[PDB]
Amino acid sequence: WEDADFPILCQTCLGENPYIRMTKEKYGKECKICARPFTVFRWCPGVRMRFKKTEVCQTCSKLKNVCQTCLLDLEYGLPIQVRDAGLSFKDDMPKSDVNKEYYTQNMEREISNSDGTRPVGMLGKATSTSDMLLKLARTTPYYKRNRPHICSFWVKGECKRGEECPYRHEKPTDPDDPRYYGINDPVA
Amino acid sequence: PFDDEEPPLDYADNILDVEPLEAIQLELDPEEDAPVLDWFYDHQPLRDSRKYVNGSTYQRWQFTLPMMSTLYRLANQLLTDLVDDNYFYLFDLKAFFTSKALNMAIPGGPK
Amino acid sequence: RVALEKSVSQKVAAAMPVRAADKLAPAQYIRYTPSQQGVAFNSGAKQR
Amino acid sequence: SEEKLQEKARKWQQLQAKRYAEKRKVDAQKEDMPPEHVRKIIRDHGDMTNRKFRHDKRVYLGALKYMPHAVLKLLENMPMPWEQ
Amino acid sequence: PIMLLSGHEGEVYCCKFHPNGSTLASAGFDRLILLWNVYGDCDNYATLKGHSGAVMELHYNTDGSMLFSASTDKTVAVWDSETGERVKRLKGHTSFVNSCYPARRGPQLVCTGSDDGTVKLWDIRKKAAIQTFQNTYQVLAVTFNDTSDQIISGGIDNDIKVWDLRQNKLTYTMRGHADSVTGLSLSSEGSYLLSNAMDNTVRVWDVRPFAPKERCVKIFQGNVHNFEKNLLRCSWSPDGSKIAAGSADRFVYVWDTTSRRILYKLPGHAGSINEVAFHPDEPIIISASSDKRLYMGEI
Amino acid sequence: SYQKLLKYYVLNALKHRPPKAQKKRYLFRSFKATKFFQSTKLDWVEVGLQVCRQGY
Amino acid sequence: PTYETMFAPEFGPENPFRTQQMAAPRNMLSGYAEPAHINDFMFEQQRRTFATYGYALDPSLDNHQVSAKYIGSVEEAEKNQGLTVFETGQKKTEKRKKFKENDASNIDGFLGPWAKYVDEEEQKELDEIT
Amino acid sequence: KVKRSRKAPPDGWELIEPTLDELDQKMREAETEPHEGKRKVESLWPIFRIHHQKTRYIFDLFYKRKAISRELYEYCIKEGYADKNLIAKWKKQGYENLCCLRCIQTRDTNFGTNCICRVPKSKLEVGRIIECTHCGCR
RNA sequence: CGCCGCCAAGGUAU
RNA sequence: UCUGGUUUCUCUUCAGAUCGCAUAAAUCUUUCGCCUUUUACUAAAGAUUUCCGUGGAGAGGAACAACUCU
Ligand SMILES: [Mg+2]
Ligand SMILES: [Zn+2]
Ligand SMILES: [Zn+2]
Ligand SMILES: [Zn+2]
Ligand SMILES: [Zn+2]
Ligand SMILES: [Zn+2]
Ligand SMILES: [Zn+2]
């Protein structure tokens, strides 16, 4: 249902290398919100970093000026809830599956086939910015987003690979502080 | 040959070391089947020989007359002694087409 | 005619694509300027 | 300016020693392997009652469409009784 | 006005000016040859398509009717400047064609050189090589004298070689470079041949029936080569008064053929410069580079 | 049985139309270029038991 | 075509009503993208150079119009004097000696390229987490 | 065992028979075990490794040592104790410490390149113990 | 002068 | 004295030759025979394809390519 040529890709997910190689597919994975068949792309950002293939589709990224794989804004590098709390206009979108979700999603994809350059509703209110959201606008961000997720068998001490296990090691996670609108625990 | 609820004999540890017993393997005598004696029982008859066969994709062949006469002698008991197309009178394809079109038949022929 | 011909050729190579089509020859690069954030983001990222 | 005058030549004839040397004007270069590979793969998979290989079993159903293309080429090459 | 041109998606390796000064030709890594109006609004018209490798070198014949194109795909194409239709493919070399030149005056001839170490003489009417000169090291740059008797070849042995078309012998060798020669070009008189080399030396060599026998006529400096290992080409001005050669340090160097003073150092390019050309009538310099843009400097 | 094989041979020889196919393909060479298909030389009974195992 | 036509700037106050991101040129909502035909070998060579030692040259066309510098980790470029990954270096430092057994005759002793090297309180917290 | 050549092969086969028989027994032991503990492909590594050491044993038996004859060398290639195309790759100049044939297939890799196993370690980065997922180690 | 060789949906509701 | 090449593996379109010294199925439009409705059907013609293979041609290698046709 969806073909693409190149995704949004904010700078913190591209990696530290301007020279990356990337493979593409024609019909890859489903989106974790609306299950639309986008084109998943796969690349290697760094030598100690995971692949971070693709999270969402192009259309849902074109609604709210969101990047492709970590679900942050392209214009700052912030989540969506901070952006529409700072601008006080939410640009509502449903929650269910077949009630009103894919209906207005297909219609907003249909009316946006001409431009493909700017979002549908944020074009008029992304201009009166840089007052309350410029105070937390991180330049040169931490690359810990790009490091791979935690592996098992080091928590239990069974990992036969030792050092050649590519994911991570000696990182005890904490079960006290970890979707599209709400609610996000560390953002509060 | 084998019952239900039984896996298909698991060819890794059953007959990997077991040799086959014997094929048909008709004993060819020398001085009558001497050109064909070395290769008549071989899955590739002539493959690594540029004199008789084309190559490994096994496309074109050239034989000689005693070697083919031994083949013609070994190819009896299923080959006719008919030489010309005179035994096929009213057994030809066109005569059978006529019999198909004319609502009739040859005794011993199709209907 | 060439518009509907390339449309119906994409349709036949999409509805019935089963019989022996090559994929592509992907020897092309793409050059996209990071014209959104970069002043110190990945220092030296100018056209990438 | 003192050793760079030959170091740039070292870089130049090191890059041009692999620029066009490997015939840039391997395409048909896959061949046979040991036959104990398929046996090890299928003795690992088996009757597919495990949770480890669950990403592959749907691919087995993807092998449903082309099965007579294998059975036909199987029965075309049956061993004759003069063979072993 | 300066005039900034753009279009080439990949690195531009060469550009030339039509013999009558009415149009430009440019090509590079993309595989496309673009034609441009020298005057007017500097418009772009035909795109020549059909090369599978990158375009290493463009040339016009003296009539401005034939455009030659050496490619990395081992083929040298002959193009009609008037219609943009392809005329011939010179299929021959076993490796990349590094460069080609077309003989002016005498009946049509073409010379090529490649990584297979050979130099070949082509007659556009035969569809086959006429002569082959096996060197042993990769050949980078080749040019004919105006008498169409000699072939001048620069390779990676730091030694420019001169070949006799009748004897088929190594007539001359020139010593004086410390490193690979990347670009050769004859004066419009046939009198002098201009060379670029990795050693960052621009050297003029004089070729004559009576030669000093130690023909390091002049040396110029300032032109830098680096790790990019780009072929570097140099050109003579229409009257032989100016010498231009591109460099890898983003500057266009133009020298005084006599005093050897740098007349111009020009910036504007972001990357390495691959070729500099002079307009045949007016003091206009076309600078082509790896930043995929062209400039029309006016002096 | 004689006359019914005569019948079938005449029905095969009568509808002997020329092979008017324009293009030709193989479907094995297209599989082999893919990284997921590999060529090896095995025994016969291993191939037969393998395809019946995969069919089950 | 004329260089003066594209070189002529736009008369205006740059229109600061938009932000720095939205007023920037683009064609996709994220950057101006266009395909090209760069060579593969030097591309992958400088890619491996930045992957190993962290320095490479800077590719563009119209950022500053003069650019021949190195990017990434700066000091390691002049420390190694600009070498590549395909070039034999000036020294052989910190080299790591393995052992070999390539007779292919012994049983459970053949260790060629598949050889292991010569060198070969958190549990309480991980129990309290789970 | 299966010989499939009816040859009664000449000298010297009696001195390589218990060695290659022990290698065949260890290859059966590397084929037999289940895949518990071994993740997806590292149970498939040692059969590649033992075919590599068997082909290397015949390789330095005939080419290096020059003891065995050419007829029995071609016999061991034709039966299955050695390869025909792999020794032609070992014949080439730049490499004879090769792993197996899965690093040379440039279209086995979707990125159109060779593996990291066929990379010199002195030009690679300093400490990484990387292993091929197709072939096993380097 | 010697046809012919049979499965299922149709019913024990959703 | 000069001239100097058979196999194997990959794309490249044309096929009008028993393309294959033999011969499968499906679709449509009609005639039938079993038939209750249908898919499974029967068996003849007309015309299309699908499919297992094949013929000659442009290149890139490798396999004794240097034995030697010329
Ligand atoms: Mg009904
Ligand atoms: Zn979506
Ligand atoms: Zn992101
Ligand atoms: Zn681990
Ligand atoms: Zn290897
Ligand atoms: Zn291996
Ligand atoms: Zn590997």
PDB file of N, CA, C and O in Angstrom, chain C:
ATOM      1  N   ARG C   1      -0.304   6.767 -25.142  1.00  0.00           N
ATOM      2  CA  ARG C   1      -0.082   5.344 -25.365  1.00  0.00           C
ATOM      3  C   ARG C   1       1.132   4.846 -24.595  1.00  0.00           C
ATOM      4  O   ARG C   1       1.091   3.763 -24.006  1.00  0.00           O
ATOM      5  N   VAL C   2       2.217   5.629 -24.561  1.00  0.00           N
ATOM      6  CA  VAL C   2       3.380   5.175 -23.801  1.00  0.00           C
ATOM      7  C   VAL C   2       3.132   5.307 -22.300  1.00  0.00           C
ATOM      8  O   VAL C   2       3.673   4.518 -21.512  1.00  0.00           O
ATOM      9  N   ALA C   3       2.269   6.244 -21.882  1.00  0.00           N
ATOM     10  CA  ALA C   3       1.904   6.346 -20.471  1.00  0.00           C
ATOM     11  C   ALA C   3       1.103   5.128 -20.018  1.00  0.00           C
ATOM     12  O   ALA C   3       1.439   4.480 -19.016  1.00  0.00           O
ATOM     13  N   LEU C   4       0.052   4.778 -20.768  1.00  0.00           N
ATOM     14  CA  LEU C   4      -0.716   3.588 -20.413  1.00  0.00           C
ATOM     15  C   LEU C   4       0.063   2.305 -20.673  1.00  0.00           C
ATOM     16  O   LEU C   4      -0.199   1.300 -20.009  1.00  0.00           O
ATOM     17  N   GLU C   5       1.051   2.330 -21.574  1.00  0.00           N
ATOM     18  CA  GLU C   5       1.869   1.150 -21.819  1.00  0.00           C
ATOM     19  C   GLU C   5       2.824   0.889 -20.663  1.00  0.00           C
ATOM     20  O   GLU C   5       2.975  -0.259 -20.235  1.00  0.00           O
ATOM     21  N   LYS C   6       3.466   1.936 -20.130  1.00  0.00           N
ATOM     22  CA  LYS C   6       4.312   1.720 -18.959  1.00  0.00           C
ATOM     23  C   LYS C   6       3.474   1.413 -17.721  1.00  0.00           C
ATOM     24  O   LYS C   6       3.910   0.629 -16.864  1.00  0.00           O
ATOM     25  N   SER C   7       2.246   1.947 -17.650  1.00  0.00           N
ATOM     26  CA  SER C   7       1.339   1.603 -16.557  1.00  0.00           C
ATOM     27  C   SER C   7       0.930   0.131 -16.615  1.00  0.00           C
ATOM     28  O   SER C   7       0.973  -0.580 -15.604  1.00  0.00           O
ATOM     29  N   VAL C   8       0.561  -0.357 -17.803  1.00  0.00           N
ATOM     30  CA  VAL C   8       0.125  -1.745 -17.911  1.00  0.00           C
ATOM     31  C   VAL C   8       1.323  -2.691 -17.851  1.00  0.00           C
ATOM     32  O   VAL C   8       1.179  -3.850 -17.451  1.00  0.00           O
ATOM     33  N   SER C   9       2.529  -2.212 -18.177  1.00  0.00           N
ATOM     34  CA  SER C   9       3.712  -3.052 -18.023  1.00  0.00           C
ATOM     35  C   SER C   9       4.069  -3.210 -16.553  1.00  0.00           C
ATOM     36  O   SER C   9       4.438  -4.304 -16.111  1.00  0.00           O
ATOM     37  N   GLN C  10       3.939  -2.129 -15.773  1.00  0.00           N
ATOM     38  CA  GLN C  10       4.099  -2.237 -14.325  1.00  0.00           C
ATOM     39  C   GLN C  10       2.992  -3.092 -13.711  1.00  0.00           C
ATOM     40  O   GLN C  10       3.222  -3.807 -12.729  1.00  0.00           O
ATOM     41  N   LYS C  11       1.796  -3.062 -14.306  1.00  0.00           N
ATOM     42  CA  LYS C  11       0.693  -3.881 -13.808  1.00  0.00           C
ATOM     43  C   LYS C  11       0.938  -5.367 -14.064  1.00  0.00           C
ATOM     44  O   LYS C  11       0.747  -6.198 -13.170  1.00  0.00           O
ATOM     45  N   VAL C  12       1.359  -5.719 -15.284  1.00  0.00           N
ATOM     46  CA  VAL C  12       1.661  -7.111 -15.619  1.00  0.00           C
ATOM     47  C   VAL C  12       2.892  -7.606 -14.856  1.00  0.00           C
ATOM     48  O   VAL C  12       2.907  -8.743 -14.364  1.00  0.00           O
ATOM     49  N   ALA C  13       3.906  -6.754 -14.668  1.00  0.00           N
ATOM     50  CA  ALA C  13       5.032  -7.113 -13.813  1.00  0.00           C
ATOM     51  C   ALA C  13       4.737  -6.882 -12.335  1.00  0.00           C
ATOM     52  O   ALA C  13       5.661  -6.936 -11.516  1.00  0.00           O
ATOM     53  N   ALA C  14       3.482  -6.596 -11.983  1.00  0.00           N
ATOM     54  CA  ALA C  14       3.035  -6.571 -10.601  1.00  0.00           C
ATOM     55  C   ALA C  14       1.923  -7.568 -10.304  1.00  0.00           C
ATOM     56  O   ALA C  14       1.957  -8.202  -9.245  1.00  0.00           O
ATOM     57  N   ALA C  15       0.945  -7.722 -11.200  1.00  0.00           N
ATOM     58  CA  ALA C  15      -0.120  -8.699 -10.998  1.00  0.00           C
ATOM     59  C   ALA C  15       0.393 -10.104 -11.280  1.00  0.00           C
ATOM     60  O   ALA C  15       0.190 -11.015 -10.472  1.00  0.00           O
ATOM     61  N   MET C  16       1.087 -10.281 -12.406  1.00  0.00           N
ATOM     62  CA  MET C  16       1.702 -11.573 -12.700  1.00  0.00           C
ATOM     63  C   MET C  16       3.229 -11.510 -12.733  1.00  0.00           C
ATOM     64  O   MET C  16       3.795 -11.664 -13.829  1.00  0.00           O
ATOM     65  N   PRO C  17       3.948 -11.297 -11.620  1.00  0.00           N
ATOM     66  CA  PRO C  17       5.400 -11.077 -11.741  1.00  0.00           C
ATOM     67  C   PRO C  17       6.221 -12.344 -11.585  1.00  0.00           C
ATOM     68  O   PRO C  17       7.448 -12.265 -11.447  1.00  0.00           O
ATOM     69  N   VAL C  18       5.575 -13.507 -11.595  1.00  0.00           N
ATOM     70  CA  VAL C  18       6.137 -14.740 -11.054  1.00  0.00           C
ATOM     71  C   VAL C  18       7.266 -15.300 -11.923  1.00  0.00           C
ATOM     72  O   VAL C  18       8.154 -16.002 -11.423  1.00  0.00           O
ATOM     73  N   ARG C  19       7.290 -14.956 -13.210  1.00  0.00           N
ATOM     74  CA  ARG C  19       8.153 -15.648 -14.160  1.00  0.00           C
ATOM     75  C   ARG C  19       9.429 -14.869 -14.449  1.00  0.00           C
ATOM     76  O   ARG C  19       9.488 -14.120 -15.431  1.00  0.00           O
ATOM     77  N   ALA C  20      10.436 -15.058 -13.586  1.00  0.00           N
ATOM     78  CA  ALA C  20      11.855 -14.825 -13.897  1.00  0.00           C
ATOM     79  C   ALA C  20      12.165 -13.375 -14.264  1.00  0.00           C
ATOM     80  O   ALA C  20      12.543 -13.065 -15.396  1.00  0.00           O
ATOM     81  N   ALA C  21      12.003 -12.476 -13.299  1.00  0.00           N
ATOM     82  CA  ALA C  21      12.396 -11.086 -13.471  1.00  0.00           C
ATOM     83  C   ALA C  21      13.587 -10.780 -12.575  1.00  0.00           C
ATOM     84  O   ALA C  21      13.620 -11.175 -11.407  1.00  0.00           O
ATOM     85  N   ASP C  22      14.569 -10.080 -13.139  1.00  0.00           N
ATOM     86  CA  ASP C  22      15.699  -9.611 -12.349  1.00  0.00           C
ATOM     87  C   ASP C  22      15.260  -8.510 -11.388  1.00  0.00           C
ATOM     88  O   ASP C  22      14.263  -7.819 -11.615  1.00  0.00           O
ATOM     89  N   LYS C  23      16.008  -8.360 -10.294  1.00  0.00           N
ATOM     90  CA  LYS C  23      15.590  -7.428  -9.247  1.00  0.00           C
ATOM     91  C   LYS C  23      15.851  -5.982  -9.656  1.00  0.00           C
ATOM     92  O   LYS C  23      14.911  -5.241  -9.966  1.00  0.00           O
ATOM     93  N   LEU C  24      17.134  -5.609  -9.756  1.00  0.00           N
ATOM     94  CA  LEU C  24      17.610  -4.260 -10.055  1.00  0.00           C
ATOM     95  C   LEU C  24      19.135  -4.336 -10.102  1.00  0.00           C
ATOM     96  O   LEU C  24      19.710  -5.372  -9.751  1.00  0.00           O
ATOM     97  N   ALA C  25      19.807  -3.262 -10.523  1.00  0.00           N
ATOM     98  CA  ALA C  25      21.261  -3.129 -10.402  1.00  0.00           C
ATOM     99  C   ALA C  25      21.552  -1.935  -9.496  1.00  0.00           C
ATOM    100  O   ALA C  25      21.767  -0.815  -9.982  1.00  0.00           O
ATOM    101  N   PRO C  26      21.566  -2.137  -8.169  1.00  0.00           N
ATOM    102  CA  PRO C  26      21.587  -1.002  -7.227  1.00  0.00           C
ATOM    103  C   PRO C  26      22.992  -0.459  -6.978  1.00  0.00           C
ATOM    104  O   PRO C  26      23.541  -0.548  -5.876  1.00  0.00           O
ATOM    105  N   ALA C  27      23.590   0.116  -8.018  1.00  0.00           N
ATOM    106  CA  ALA C  27      24.908   0.725  -7.902  1.00  0.00           C
ATOM    107  C   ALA C  27      24.843   2.236  -7.734  1.00  0.00           C
ATOM    108  O   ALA C  27      25.870   2.908  -7.872  1.00  0.00           O
ATOM    109  N   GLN C  28      23.666   2.787  -7.440  1.00  0.00           N
ATOM    110  CA  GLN C  28      23.498   4.233  -7.348  1.00  0.00           C
ATOM    111  C   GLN C  28      23.649   4.681  -5.897  1.00  0.00           C
ATOM    112  O   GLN C  28      23.282   3.954  -4.967  1.00  0.00           O
ATOM    113  N   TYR C  29      24.231   5.861  -5.704  1.00  0.00           N
ATOM    114  CA  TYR C  29      24.278   6.491  -4.393  1.00  0.00           C
ATOM    115  C   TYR C  29      23.216   7.579  -4.315  1.00  0.00           C
ATOM    116  O   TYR C  29      22.628   7.968  -5.329  1.00  0.00           O
ATOM    117  N   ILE C  30      22.960   8.073  -3.105  1.00  0.00           N
ATOM    118  CA  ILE C  30      22.058   9.211  -2.942  1.00  0.00           C
ATOM    119  C   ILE C  30      22.697  10.209  -1.981  1.00  0.00           C
ATOM    120  O   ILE C  30      23.278   9.820  -0.960  1.00  0.00           O
ATOM    121  N   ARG C  31      22.629  11.491  -2.334  1.00  0.00           N
ATOM    122  CA  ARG C  31      23.298  12.554  -1.594  1.00  0.00           C
ATOM    123  C   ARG C  31      22.249  13.537  -1.080  1.00  0.00           C
ATOM    124  O   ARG C  31      21.621  14.250  -1.871  1.00  0.00           O
ATOM    125  N   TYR C  32      22.059  13.574   0.240  1.00  0.00           N
ATOM    126  CA  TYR C  32      20.990  14.352   0.862  1.00  0.00           C
ATOM    127  C   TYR C  32      21.602  15.293   1.893  1.00  0.00           C
ATOM    128  O   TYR C  32      22.284  14.850   2.820  1.00  0.00           O
ATOM    129  N   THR C  33      21.380  16.588   1.724  1.00  0.00           N
ATOM    130  CA  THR C  33      22.025  17.558   2.604  1.00  0.00           C
ATOM    131  C   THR C  33      21.364  17.576   3.982  1.00  0.00           C
ATOM    132  O   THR C  33      20.129  17.595   4.073  1.00  0.00           O
ATOM    133  N   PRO C  34      22.137  17.498   5.073  1.00  0.00           N
ATOM    134  CA  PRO C  34      21.543  17.622   6.411  1.00  0.00           C
ATOM    135  C   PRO C  34      21.211  19.067   6.743  1.00  0.00           C
ATOM    136  O   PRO C  34      21.894  19.709   7.548  1.00  0.00           O
ATOM    137  N   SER C  35      20.151  19.587   6.128  1.00  0.00           N
ATOM    138  CA  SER C  35      19.828  21.002   6.231  1.00  0.00           C
ATOM    139  C   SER C  35      18.721  21.224   7.255  1.00  0.00           C
ATOM    140  O   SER C  35      17.869  22.101   7.081  1.00  0.00           O
ATOM    141  N   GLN C  36      18.725  20.428   8.321  1.00  0.00           N
ATOM    142  CA  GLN C  36      17.741  20.540   9.390  1.00  0.00           C
ATOM    143  C   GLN C  36      18.361  20.955  10.713  1.00  0.00           C
ATOM    144  O   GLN C  36      17.832  21.846  11.389  1.00  0.00           O
ATOM    145  N   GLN C  37      19.476  20.336  11.105  1.00  0.00           N
ATOM    146  CA  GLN C  37      20.041  20.566  12.427  1.00  0.00           C
ATOM    147  C   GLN C  37      21.507  20.972  12.425  1.00  0.00           C
ATOM    148  O   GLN C  37      21.909  21.736  13.308  1.00  0.00           O
ATOM    149  N   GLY C  38      22.306  20.518  11.458  1.00  0.00           N
ATOM    150  CA  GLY C  38      23.752  20.504  11.591  1.00  0.00           C
ATOM    151  C   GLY C  38      24.488  21.828  11.662  1.00  0.00           C
ATOM    152  O   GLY C  38      24.653  22.526  10.657  1.00  0.00           O
ATOM    153  N   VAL C  39      24.931  22.174  12.871  1.00  0.00           N
ATOM    154  CA  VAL C  39      25.921  23.220  13.098  1.00  0.00           C
ATOM    155  C   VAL C  39      27.100  22.594  13.839  1.00  0.00           C
ATOM    156  O   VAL C  39      28.263  22.894  13.547  1.00  0.00           O
ATOM    157  N   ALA C  40      26.802  21.718  14.802  1.00  0.00           N
ATOM    158  CA  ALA C  40      27.797  20.873  15.450  1.00  0.00           C
ATOM    159  C   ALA C  40      27.383  19.412  15.502  1.00  0.00           C
ATOM    160  O   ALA C  40      28.165  18.589  15.989  1.00  0.00           O
ATOM    161  N   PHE C  41      26.181  19.066  15.035  1.00  0.00           N
ATOM    162  CA  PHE C  41      25.730  17.686  14.899  1.00  0.00           C
ATOM    163  C   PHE C  41      26.581  16.941  13.884  1.00  0.00           C
ATOM    164  O   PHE C  41      26.492  17.243  12.687  1.00  0.00           O
ATOM    165  N   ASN C  42      27.383  15.976  14.355  1.00  0.00           N
ATOM    166  CA  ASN C  42      28.259  15.132  13.532  1.00  0.00           C
ATOM    167  C   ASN C  42      29.214  16.002  12.709  1.00  0.00           C
ATOM    168  O   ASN C  42      29.113  16.083  11.485  1.00  0.00           O
ATOM    169  N   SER C  43      30.131  16.656  13.438  1.00  0.00           N
ATOM    170  CA  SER C  43      30.900  17.816  12.986  1.00  0.00           C
ATOM    171  C   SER C  43      31.623  17.605  11.659  1.00  0.00           C
ATOM    172  O   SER C  43      32.582  16.832  11.570  1.00  0.00           O
ATOM    173  N   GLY C  44      31.153  18.303  10.629  1.00  0.00           N
ATOM    174  CA  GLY C  44      31.578  18.073   9.266  1.00  0.00           C
ATOM    175  C   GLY C  44      30.545  17.435   8.357  1.00  0.00           C
ATOM    176  O   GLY C  44      30.847  17.202   7.181  1.00  0.00           O
ATOM    177  N   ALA C  45      29.342  17.145   8.858  1.00  0.00           N
ATOM    178  CA  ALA C  45      28.269  16.614   8.024  1.00  0.00           C
ATOM    179  C   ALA C  45      27.682  17.719   7.164  1.00  0.00           C
ATOM    180  O   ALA C  45      26.891  18.535   7.647  1.00  0.00           O
ATOM    181  N   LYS C  46      28.062  17.762   5.889  1.00  0.00           N
ATOM    182  CA  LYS C  46      27.662  18.892   5.063  1.00  0.00           C
ATOM    183  C   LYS C  46      26.751  18.475   3.908  1.00  0.00           C
ATOM    184  O   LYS C  46      25.787  19.185   3.597  1.00  0.00           O
ATOM    185  N   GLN C  47      27.021  17.339   3.252  1.00  0.00           N
ATOM    186  CA  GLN C  47      26.035  16.862   2.285  1.00  0.00           C
ATOM    187  C   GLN C  47      25.803  15.346   2.304  1.00  0.00           C
ATOM    188  O   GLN C  47      24.823  14.907   1.697  1.00  0.00           O
ATOM    189  N   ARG C  48      26.673  14.545   2.938  1.00  0.00           N
ATOM    190  CA  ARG C  48      26.397  13.189   3.457  1.00  0.00           C
ATOM    191  C   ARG C  48      25.843  12.230   2.386  1.00  0.00           C
ATOM    192  O   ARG C  48      24.664  11.869   2.375  1.00  0.00           O
TER     193      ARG C  48
END
